[PDB]
Amino acid sequence: EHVRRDLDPNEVWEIVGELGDGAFGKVYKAKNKETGALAAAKVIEEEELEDYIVEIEILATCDHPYIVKLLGAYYHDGKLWIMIEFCPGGAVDAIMLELDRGLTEPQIQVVCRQMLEALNFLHSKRIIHRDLKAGNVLMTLEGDIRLADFGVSAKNLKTFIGTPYWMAPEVVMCETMKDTPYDYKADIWSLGITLIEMAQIEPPHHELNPMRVLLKIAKSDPPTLLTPSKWSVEFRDFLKIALDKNPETRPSAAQLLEHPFVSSITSNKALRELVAEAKA
Numbered sequence: 576e577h578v579r580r581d582l583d584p585n586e587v588w589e590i591v592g593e594l595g596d597g598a599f600g601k602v603y604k605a606k607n608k609e610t611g612a613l614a615a616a617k618v619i620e621e622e623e624l625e626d627y628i629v630e631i632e633i634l635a636t637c638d639h640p641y642i643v644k645l646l647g648a649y650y651h652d653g654k655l656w657i658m659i660e661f662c663p664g665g666a667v668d669a670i671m672l673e674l675d676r677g678l679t680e681p682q683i684q685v686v687c688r689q690m691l692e693a694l695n696f697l698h699s700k701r702i703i704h705r706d707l708k709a710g711n712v713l714m715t716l717e718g719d720i721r722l723a724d725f726g727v728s729a730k731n732l733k734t735f736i737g738t739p740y741w742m743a744p745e746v747v748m749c750e751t752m753k754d755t756p757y758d759y760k761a762d763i764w765s766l767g768i769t770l771i772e773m774a775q776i777e778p779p780h781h782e783l784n785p786m787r788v789l790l791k792i793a794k795s796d797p798p799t800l801l802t803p804s805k806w807s808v809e810f811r812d813f814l815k816i817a818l819d820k821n822p823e824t825r826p827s828a829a830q831l832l833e834h835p836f837v838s839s840i841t842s843n844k845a846l847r848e849l850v851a852e853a854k855a
């Protein structure tokens with residue numbers, strides 16, 4: 576549940592390959608030498624270290640099925656190693672790319688439902704995820720999601736990829752955000768944008784340069800689905816309430832769980848069918 580300075584990671588873990596590409600940085604597939612357990616590993620090279628300690632303490636102290644598990648954190652030579660539960664389905668954005676299509680509404684409903692439960696969990700503990708997007712929603716073969724990353728990939732990219740298309744309007748110009756009573760609501764806006772991304776492959780304003788996107792998010796009316804006819808009234812209403820520019824009136828994850836779009840979702844079937852198809 577923390578970082579081990581007294582251990583060399585190469586005693587525990589063998590590197591067997593690379594996952595994705597893909598800016599944000601190098602992600603390694605690792606295999607435990609004792610157990611055979613698989614991990615995704617990021618290997619990042621005390622003032623550039625306590626940046627990551629908050630994220631590792633989070634991933635350690637979160638016991639929830641829809642959040643990724645920390646399998647090990649090591650500090651050896653100059654590098655910080657973070658070993659995370661391997662999610663064999665990979666990221667949702669990578670799946671949409673493979674199949675050259677967006678998710679169906681039923682599939683989106685499962686992801687949404689599971690993301691809301693995870694965020695309700697995190698927000699009850701005053702943890703804010705800070706980087707929700709399809710790229711940080713990873714999948715199991717059983718058709719569940721795992722919320723990943725928690726900001727780490729963008730902090731590491733800080734040493735047009737990483738443009739914050741998913742960022743809430745109230746914080747789009749901020750490097751660091753104030754502690755306020757509606758700070759966690761920034762995740763809910765990002766959830767909304769992630770749903771549009773899953774519906775359309777790309778988030779709103781994907782065509783624009785990074786600077787222009789900040790301004791566009793700040794100024795524009797909340798984004799809506801490009802082709803409303805394809806989508807239920809529940810989906811559109813859900814987006815409309817989640818994508819509220821005012822963070823005080825924007826609903827919590829608990830409130831959105833009571834919305835018709837997701838309140839009856841009890842099976843992950845649609846997601847299992849999706850992952851089955853991308854394996855084949």
Ligand SMILES: COc1cc(Nc2c(C#N)cnc3cc(OCCCN4CCN(C)CC4)c(OC)cc23)c(Cl)cc1Cl
Binds near residue numbers: 602615663664710728
């Ligand atoms: C360790 O650190 C981090 C790792 C991650 N990312 C990953 C975590 C985590 N966590 C877990 N598991 C992952 C699994 C992945 O792909 C495996 C499946 C490959 N495809 C299967 C389907 N076939 C057709 C094509 C290949 C993956 O791929 C890019 C990234 C993963 C992030 Cl997002 C942030 C941080 Cl900080």
Ligand SMILES: [Cl-]
Binds near residue numbers: 787790791794
């Ligand atoms: Cl603008």
